[PDB]
Every structure is written in C-alpha cells, then in structure tokens.
Symmetry: C3
Subunit: 544 residues, 3 copies
C-alpha cells in the first residue's frame, strides 16, 4: 500500500488541497491541485544530462482540458479531443511565462510541464489552479528553480479589490487580472479591465501579490516534508582567459556598432563582427568550443547596451528615455473593405483591418466551464517578412495567439455593447514590419480601423511597451523599447489604454527584485506616451 502526503490550507474563500507521491512516481515531479472542487493534475519531467549541442533553454508547457471534467462527451466528429483551442493555448502561456525567468542562467536541460485538468467547478477557474501545480511540482522536482510562485486573481467591485472572483461575480466586476511572482517580487501580470486610472490599476497588482503569499508559504513547507533533494547542478566556470581574449577584438567594434539608427544596417553589421571574430579564433586553434564563443559575444552585446543607458548616454537610435519614435497614421488604406488602417511607429507597423457581419457569424466557443458566443473577434498574424527572414506560414503559433488575445483585451473595454451595436466584428492585424512592440501598435491600428468601419467606439484607444535597465539598486525606465532593448533588457512592460484610463496591460519581467516604487515610474511615464499616440491619432480621425 502507498499513501500520499497531503497539506490543506485556506485561500480566500476556498480550501486548496495539495497531494504528492502517489500517482506519478516515474515522473520527477507530480502534484494534484484542488482549489475547492476544480482539480488540475500537473507533472514536471526533467532530464539530468541534456544534449551538449544546446544553446537555448528548452522549456515546454502543455496545457490540456479534459472533457470528463465537466461531465460531457466532446462535440467533435471523432468524439475525442485533439488540438488545443484558443483558451487552452492562452493558459499554457500563462503558466510558462512566470516560471521561465526563475531558472538559473546557463541551465540548458530540457524540462516539460504537463498540466491536465481532472475535474472542474463552473464557479472557480482552473487557470490559477494549474499555476499552483507548476509552482508546487517544479519545487518538488529537485531541478534548480527559484520561488515558488503564487497564483492570484483580482476582481474590482464597489471601488475595492476582491480576491478570486467567480463567474457570477465577474459579471458585476470591472477589473480582471491574474498576478504571478515569487515571495520577493512580482513576475507577470495579465490584465483585462474597464477604464480605471493609473493608481488603482497598480494597487490591484500589489493586492494580489500580498494575497498569494499564503500559497507560497504552504508549498515551501511541503518541500521540506515530501520534496526530493536538489539537483547537483553547477554553471560552466567563468573563463577569464577567453573573456579578455575575445573582448580585445570584439568589444571595441561592437561598441561602435550599437550607434546605428537603422535596424537593417545594424543587424548586418553585428553579423559580420560575429562572423570574422569566430573565424579568426577557429584559425588560431580548432579546440575552442564554437558555441562558447557565441555566448561571450552575446554577453558583450548585453554589456554595451545596458551600461550606456545607466550612464545617461543616448540610446541605440539616439533617443532619450521618455522619448518615443516617430508616428505615421493612415486611415482608409484598403478600397473594398469595411475598415482599414496603417499605423506606423518608427520602423514597426501593422496593417489592421475591420470586418462587419450578422449575429449568425459569431464564434461559438465550446469551453469547459460553459458554452458562450463571442461577438468581438481579434486575430494576430506574424509573417516572416516582418523581421526580415524566411520561415513557415499557415497555422498561427503560440505567441501569434497570445498577442492576439492581448490586443483584444485592450479594445474590449472600449467596444460598444450589443444594445447599441448588434453586429459581429472581426479585426485582423497584419504585422508588416517588426522591431519593438507588435501587440501594442495594433491596438492603435484597431481603434483607427473600427472607426473607419463605422463602429461607434466609446473613446480612441492606444498603447505602448516599456522597458527597464536595472543594475544593483538604481534603474532607468525606457519609453517605447526597440528589439535590442527587449531581448537584452529586464522587462517588457506593455501598457494599453485610452485618453481617460487604462484598458489592459501586460507585465513580463525577466529578473527578480522588482519593486512597487519603480512600478509607479513605469506606469506614469507610459501614460504620458499614451496621450502622445492619441494626439496624432485624433489629428487624422476623431469621429466614427
């Protein structure tokens, strides 16, 4: 006989139960989460010795909702679920994003987080239930993983924050955000609100982070109770011999390379510097490990950008911190469509179109919690010609779907109700070129496309992404980040809203140690830039 080890704790209005060490033993980690009646079984499998020819951390999270959870036989032709829907893909991204940055730098081992829904209650979502599982299992696995993260859902009724609102409570609620992060700092946040202000939008993030602290403490006690011992992993020793040998040839040229304004001219230049430096090092001796060099050159690229921002020197394209790129607004680009828009910011632009139809063309979503019909439709396409390369095209990938739901949340608060406008609207965003924010601009393109179409929107809506360069305690907040300022930066602080308030913001932080004090600066500077986008948008069109 095998007996499981359990621990029960009160969380909000529901009693969350965690179980381990009875179901999957062959898997490195296995926990079964049960908020109140909704259960999600999460397993984490990680290899001890991965491949040697790996340069990227290969983490994959597969979220899947079982049909027997609600107690219904699937409506598919084969009577068996198959491909994940738009709902299941968004939750998969909601679990990956917070857990990714907690892994130590230099960890290249393949890990897979399989989260399957067991049972479901029509009141409690299982999003946040699955996020606790990936937080509990990964801490019990032994795999080097900081945290663990807490999962919290924030509501807003009567100008006051409510922890974990049900489906019936969400009908009267104004704000709907999911907050995740470690005990020390916040890590992500996915929001969907009405038109709240800047102060109350930040207060909900702090509220949820304080409430999720109960979950974090209960997992930590379970690690010392049933958790497997930590992996004996050590990062590759910092070779000071090569870090001065490569830098004496590359750091001098790469410092001058990051002053070019054009993206095409800069990326072609840094590729040449990376090519001939390795070519010379291979000509010296064939012992030097190729990849190794690729990470040293990448470390120099990170050091050149970050140090110049902290000192007070001009950015890549030679732009101050609170300064943004130039704007180009074009309404009515297509001839035989309902609505069309061409919004351009610097060197990134989105061809956004709007379509109108009857209520019969509504998307009938067969969700696990309940069957609902979606009136407003938003689609995000990211073709390879935007970044300037070749790739596969046909079916939308993870992001494509994630950024599409993001741009939907930023407009959903503005969109008129069915009582005034009873027509199904489909908005398609086509990324023509991409350098900084592609999900954001869109929201700017959607507002121009919906007016042009004839949709009576409440107020013009815009949005821009923010960044951060943090080293020690001091920090610099960036307005309208570039491609090199996001991949080498510390966070992708996306904010979208109207003239009055904020519709929806996405918080993606890569480092731990983020504070509420530096959150206010990033929130306030985004509002000043948001009004600047709208000042040019209202210059072209101001009425539907």
């Amino acid at each position: 006989m095998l007996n499981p080890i359990v621990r029960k704790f009160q969380y909000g209005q529901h009693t969350v139960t965690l179980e381990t060490g009875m179901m999957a033993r062959q898997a490195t980690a296995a926990v079964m989460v049960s908020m109140d009646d909704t259960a999600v079984f999460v397993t984490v499998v990680g290899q001890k010795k991965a491949k040697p020819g790996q340069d990227f951390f290969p983490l994959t999270v597969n979220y899947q909702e079982r049909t027997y959870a609600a107690g219904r036989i699937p409506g598919s032709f084969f009577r068996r679920e198959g491909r994940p829907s738009e709902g299941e893909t968004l939750i998969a991204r909601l679990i990956d994003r917070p857990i990714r940055p907690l892994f130590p730098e230099g960890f290249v081992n393949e890990v897979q987080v399989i989260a399957t829904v067991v049972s479901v209650n029509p009141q409690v979502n299982p999003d946040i239930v699955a996020m606790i599982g990936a937080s509990a299992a990964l801490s019990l696995s032994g795999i080097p993983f900081n945290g663990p993260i807490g999962a919290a859902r924030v509501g807003y009724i009567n100008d006051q924050y409510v922890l974990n609102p049900t489906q019936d409570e969400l009908k009267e609620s104004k704000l709907d955000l999911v907050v995740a992060g470690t005990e020390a700092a916040v890590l992500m946040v996915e929001s969907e609100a009405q038109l709240l202000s800047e102060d109350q939008m930040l207060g909900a993030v702090v509220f949820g982070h304080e409430q999720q602290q109960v979950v974090i403490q209960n997992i930590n006690e379970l690690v010392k109770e049933a958790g497997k011992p930590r992996w004996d992993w050590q990062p590759e020793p910092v070779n000071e011999a090569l870090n001065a040998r490569v830098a004496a040839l590359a750091e001098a040229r790469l410092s001058d390379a990051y002053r070019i304004t054009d993206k095409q001219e800069r990326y072609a230049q840094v590729d040449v510097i990376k090519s001939e430096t390795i070519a010379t090092l291979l000509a010296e001796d064939e012992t030097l490990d190729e990849n190794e060099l690729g990470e040293i050159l990448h470390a120099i690229e990170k050091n050149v950008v970050r140090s110049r921002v902290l000192a007070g020197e001009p950015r890549i394209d030679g732009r101050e911190k609170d300064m943004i790129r130039g704007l180009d607004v074009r309404t009515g680009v297509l001839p035989r469509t309902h609505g069309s828009a061409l919004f351009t910011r610097g060197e990134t632009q989105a061809l956004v179109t709007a379509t109108l139809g009857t209520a019969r063309d509504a998307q009938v979503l067969d969700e696990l919690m309940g069957e609902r019909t979606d009136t407003f439709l938003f689609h995000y396409n990211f073709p390879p010609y935007s970044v300037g390369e070749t790739g596969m095209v046909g079916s939308p990938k993870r992001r494509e779907i994630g950024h599409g739901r993001l741009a939907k949340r930023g407009v959903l608060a503005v969109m008129p109700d069915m009582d005034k406008f009873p027509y199904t609207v489909r908005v398609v965003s086509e990324i023509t070129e991409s350098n900084g924010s592609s999900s954001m601009a869109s929201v700017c393109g959607a507002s121009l496309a919906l007016m042009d179409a004839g949709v009576p929107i409440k107020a013009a809506v815009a949005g821009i992404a923010m960044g951060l360069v943090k080293e020690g305690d001091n920090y610099v907040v960036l307005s309208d980040i570039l491609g090199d300022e996001d991949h080498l930066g510390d966070m992708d602080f996306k904010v979208a809203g109207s003239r009055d308030g904020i519709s929806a913001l996405q918080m993606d932080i890569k480092i731990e140690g983020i504070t509420k004090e530096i959150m206010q600066v990033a929130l306030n500077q985004a509002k000043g830039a948001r009004l600047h986008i709208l000042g040019v948008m209202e210059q072209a069109i101001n009425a539907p």
Copy 2:
C-alpha cells in the same frame, strides 16, 4: 500486350484470386487479392541500399480504405479520403504485427508495405484480404522473409466453429478473432469474446491456424512460379575477438545491473555501463563502430535476463515465476466526474474515468461497409510522464489507438445492453506510470470506473499479461511481466475477462516454433492470475 499471372483457390465458402506481374510493375512486389466482391491492392517497396547509421529495422505499414470501393462519395468538406481513421489504423496493425518478427535479425533496410482497398463486399471484411495480400507480396518480393502467413476469422456459433463468418453471421456469433501464423507456428492473434472458457478459446486459435494452411500452400506455389530471385543478403559475420573483449568488461556489470529491482535506479545504472564501455573502447581504438557495440551490449542484456529465468532463480524484481505484483485498488478518487477509478499494479498505474451521455453524444462511425452508431467509448492516452521521459504531449500515436480498442474488447462483453441501459458511456484511461502492461491495467480500472458511475455491468472484469522465455525446446512461463521482460522475452500474452470466462485475448508471439501444448499452460496460469486481481477488486466493490 500486357499479361497477368492468375491463381484461384477455394477457401471456405469464398474464392480467393491472386494476380501479379501487370499492376505496379515498377515496385518490387504488387499483388491484387480480391475475393467475392472486394479486394486490397498491396505493394511492397524495399530499398537495395541501407542507411548510413540505420540501427533499428524501419517497417511502415499504411492501410487505407478508398470510398469508391463501395461506390460512394466521401462525406467531408474536401470530399476526399484524408488521414486514416480509428478503424484504418487498427487493420494496419493487424498487417504490421505478424510480418515484423519474420524479418531476420540484422536486417536494417527500409521496407514499406502499403494496402489500399479498391472494391468491397458488405459481407466479406477487407482485413484478412489485406493480410493475405501482404503475405503474398512480401513472399514474391524477394526481400528476406520467413513466411508466408495465413489469415482467418474463427467465430463461434452453436458450440461450433465456422471459417470466416459473414457480417450477418457475426451478429449471432459469440466470438470474433483474427489469427495469423506460418506453416510451422502461430504469430499473432487479436480477439473479442462473450465470456468463453479456456478450452474453447484455445481450440479457436488452433482451428483458425489449421484452416489458413491452404492459403500458405497456394502462396508458396505462386512464389515457385512467378517469384523474383531472392536477395543476396547475409548477416554480419560474428567474431569472438570483439565479443569476449566486451563480455570480460560488461557482462559482470550487467549481471548486477538487473538486480536493482527499481525501474528508475535500474535504467540509470544500465545507461552508465553503456556510456562507459563504449567510451573506454573508443579511447583504446577510435576506428570501431559505435552502432555495432550497442548491438553486442543488447545481446548480453538478452543473455543475462533469459538465463536467470530459464533456471530456477528469481527474476529482475525478486518475484517467482508465477508470483504477481502488488495491487492498489481505488475508486471515487475524483470529485466532479461521473465515475472515478485509480488502479495500480506494482509499478504501472492507470487513472480511469467514466462519463455518461444521451443518444445525442453517440459516436457516428463512417465505415466503408456502412454507417453505424457506437454506444460504448474507450480512449487510451499514453503521456511521456508515464515512463519518465519528455515527448510531445500531442497525440495520438498508433500504439495509443491499438491499445484503446484492446481494452474496449475486454469490457464490451461485460457492458449492459441498450434496452436495460440507454446511455452512451465514454471511458478515458490515463496512464500515470508505465512498467509492464498498462493496457491490461486499463481494463481493471474500467470496471471500477463503471461501478462508481452507476453503470450496471454484468460482473467485475480484470486483465493481466504473460511472458515466455524459450531456448531449444524447454520453456518457462512468467506471470505479470515487467517492461523489459516484454522486450527481452518472446511473447506478449494478454488475457482479459471475468471469473466465468474470457472477454479479450491478445497473442503477440515474436519467435517461431511455438507449441500448442505450451499455450494451454500459459492460458490456464493466466486464469489463476486474473482471479487474484478480481478478488481485491471485489473487496473494494462487488456491486454498483
């Protein structure tokens, strides 16, 4: 003018016609086997040149069912037969399973045996017609094949046997099995029975094997008449200079490596030896093939386990040759689903669920013969976290479909009729951990899920797997085999049924020379092992 080579012979109540030499002359083999209204054109293509590193034998069988065989336009959006359905995959396995062990060891050349149905009779099933088709083609191809095999459906009407029962006669029949084997011995068997005794179930396998002998004789005469010259292929010359060089270094390590008992600790130890023995030989001589060294180590692994079980000595986990693994019967493990079950046998586990629905949720099967509705549903999911590896959560592999119907056949005889219980039942089996037989454990969890849901089944149903190790003429029968035992053994003898009779039986023999005398011993020992599972199941629940 083109000319065909025709052979006709009487087989039961049907006449079988074999044509070769005119259709698909470019392919190594092409045989047109069409009985009384219906046929399955089968072609074999084998590459003369083997891969560069190819180690395993790549055999791929694609069985597809054209809709114009019955004379009907397919009911789809594209109006064309696309990817194979649940049915098409099953027959493909009935073609792939008997032919695979007949290919000689050391043969790594890629071969493809595809079968396409070109016309069809509502009374004669295309499954055995395709099996004879592949048997005739592979023998006429020239590719090293130790066949040919015969195909026969046995059935059971009025305490008697009838060779290849028709679709109308199958409704009155209490048995439905397809037997495949050579002139010397049996090789496979896929069966479905309505609670039959061991003597009647064993006598059915012998009956079908004796009746299919005329098929083998008629194929052999065609090979002597219109057969392509056999391939000049010889296995790698076995040298004792390299074998004893590894055996004096690895056999001592591998002997203690199979005494570890625990799966995770055994596989970790057995991988270390493989990773070190090859590495130490490469340090001494780097001109040796790594691919050859792994095949020798696999032969040593085969010699250690088989010799220990051949003599009176406990196996890899400490069990005797009839002793079965420990049991953990659990039900009502999940809250918000109709039926819950948790079955664990030693180191294998299956989370089985039950779901109830109306006649609206019935599976509408669009088969080649005609449209029918399926009331009982069974799905088999095999995730990567079961064995402790990383894979694509995606699905569903073939083995997943083949084992899905396997467990469906074991419960179908137990399941109540439509009149007494007019509800469509959906059963989903989730493999939590895998070691030994997980398909037989799915049948044990199925009965527990149905009783928890409230489904009034006839009796309790259970299932176990049996193994064999034979060297010369003497044999040792194993009860409830482990994973490896299945790979390093000789046969996968699966038996599923109740206390009274057998509901399902699968016979997957990988070696020829199997005796009728040893089959009645393995089936009788399986009955005693099945009653042990059923006794513990009745302890937790004996009625719904």
Copy 3:
C-alpha cells in the same frame, strides 16, 4: 515622414497600380499591386548567405486568401483562414512555375514569395494580380532574376480574343487561359477550351503574350526609378582539370548506360556508375566535395541524351522523334464499383475509377469571390510505389493537386450538362507506375472509366506530353517523352483533347528563347499522337 513610390498604368481596361517603399521596409522587396479594386500584397525575402549543405534551389511560393478582402467573416469553426485550400494551392503553383526557370543556373540561396489577398473586386480575379506582384517584387529586390514577366488572361467570345475577361464574361467565353512569359519569350501556360482547334489555341497564346508586354515595360521603368541594386553574385567557376578528370572515367560507360530500354535496368546502371566513380575519386583524394562531383556527373547525363537526339540518333528506349510508346487499354477491372479503367502507356499506368452520386454529395467550395458548388470531382494520387521508392502518405501534395486540376481541365469540357445528367460524378486516379506523363495518362483513363460507369460523355478524350531538345536554333520535337527526356530536356508541353478539338493545354518551359514555329509544331505533332490513342481507346469501348 514615410513616402511611397507609385506608378499606375493601363492594361486593356482596368488600371493597374503599383506601389513600393512604404509597406514592409525590413524585407528585401514588397509591392502593393491591384487593378480595379482587387489588391494582392506580395513580398519577396532573399537570404544573403546560403546554407553550407545545399545542392538544389529552394523556391517556396505560398499564396493565401484572406476573407476580410470581400468583407465577410469566414464560415470556419475557429473563424480563421489558416491552412491553404484546394484553390489557394493552384494559384500558388501558377506563380511558382513561370518564375522558377528565370533564376540563374547554380543559384542555391533560399527565397520566399509571400503573396496575400488584402482586397478583392467580385469581377477582377486576384490570380493574375498576384503574378504581376511577384514579377515586380523579384525585379525590385536585386536578387538575380532574368525577368520581369507579364500576366494575361485570354478569353474567346464570338470567335474573337478578349483580354482579361471578368467572371460574368467567362460564361460566354469558350476558352480560359493564363499566359506568362518575358519580353522575348513565353514561359508557362495553363488553359481550358471547349474543343478548339490548334490554330485557335496557338493564336491565343500569342495574343496574350503581346498584350502583357505593357505590364513588363512598366515594371522595368519602376526598377529604374526605385529599384534596389542587383546582387553581387557569381556562380561556381568551371573546373577544367576536374570535368575532364571525371569524363575520362565515367562518360565512356554512362553513354552506354542511356542506351538500354528498361527503366529499372537503366536507373540501377546509372546509379552503380556514380557509386563507383565517386568512391574512386574520394579514395584518390578526400579534398573534393560530395555535391560538386554529382553536378559534373549530371552534366554528362544531360550531354549524352541531348547530343543523340539533336543529331538524329535513336532515343533511349529505341524510339523515333515522333514515335509513341505501346498502349494497353483495359476497362471493367473492378467488380463492386461504378467505373473501372486500367490505361497503360509504355511503362506508365493509371488505375482510374468513376463514382456516381447525388446533388447532396457535391463539394461546396468556399472560394473568396463566389459561392459556387462543384458537381464534378477529380482526385490525383501519386504514391511512392509508382516510381519504386519509399515515402510518406497523408495529405495530398502540391504536385498532386496541380495535376488533379490539370487532368480535370481535359475532362470538364467534354462532359455533359446537368440538365441531361443530374448526377454528381467523382473521378479518382491511382498511379501504380510512372515514367513519362501520368497526369495526361489520367485523362485517357478518365474517359474509359466514365464510359464504364454509364456517363453519357459527348466524346472520348485522350492526350500526351511533348518535349524539346534545343541548344542553338535548330530543334527536335519529341512525342510522348520519358522521365529522363523531361528533366534533361528543355520544356514540358502537355496537350489533351478529343478527336475534333483540344480540351486542355499546359506549357512548362525551362529555357528562354522559344519561337512561334516550334510551339505550333509541338501542338500539331501532339494531334497525331492524340488520334493514335483515341483509335486504340475506341477498339475497347465507344458507347456507354
């Protein structure tokens, strides 16, 4: 801030507008094309450096129609276009085919042509608009391209040729062809014509070629205005010391290798020479490249065949310049289906079947501009066993859909109306062996299958493909070419029709400098071979 470069002109009636320099700046080239209201946004991306291990030229043209162009929400389940349809792949091939031979010999850099429909007029067809867009983008990119090409649709109303007919004007027309080619010579060509004569079909190609000249002139002027400078590219230099080194060892017996008749004996002989020549050259020195030696051997294979045909020597299988291979006509090959046919030409055969149905079984094509329901279906299947190789079977390949419609082009014109025959007919072609033209042999098998089914077709239809060997100004026209005479040849000239007129005409030229006189001779010589097949076809069956 952002300025476009625009040039608009006239092309018969609808004014064609071309725009570049604003949309998609990151990519290599992006041109906004359109006529009246139909707009197709085409992008071309070319990679600077080639992949180390490349031997072939990777051209991947993908055409995607988006439903917001017409102003309609898609009728799909997810409400997203996604994967390319049956129609979308045909236009993708219609763009890929003419542009492929224009790339210089030796160029191996990966290029992608992404053409997407963004706006559409219900009268103007996007297919010719997308072809102009790709022609403009490839010329403005700088990537080595020997264009530009023009696109013209030719109709035939009241014995007169009409340039670019609208969808309403096509109902009166008896011809619908899409002609493509450079300023000096024609390239590809696909037609469909209710039994028209040779001079009518030939004159229509010349008509469209002369009318599309104004398009090419306006593209060339735009390149002179705002075109990115031509790529600094130079092909691999001719190795005089290596080309003679291989020839003095391989060319001697490779000349005798293309002398034997049988395909299986020839392809085994040309492979065994290559397997021995390269093995000896690698043993002599290991500094040589694997792919470089194969390119010289292929040049020998090309030179041996072409030199014999041009001089006046007998062909590979011992045929004359106008001689057609042996024919085998069989019908009623299958028992339990409506239509059955087994047509064989030389060593190529197609198992063609005809299936009868009702109006309920008709395919509803959700095309961009249109709601038409197709009553006639044609499906082409090219399995791996036809060529004697091993591959993967699943979703119909681009080559299968292209030949499927191409075989449909010849049958649709001769088929009876819905008023006299109100049954939906499905035709499925199965290629069992292939060497010459299996797509045109499917048309011959289609007429035999329909007569066996009972379809009252107006006349019998047959056809063959034509080849040409031209290196100077003198030419040799070949009737019914092989696989070796098509790859090493210069053009693929497909003709299909009845005893009175031509139903289908396809033109696939790989070389520049095609004259008017060689196009009519290849068409007139095809008529003689077409009458030969129909004469043998009438011997078996003449009336249903």
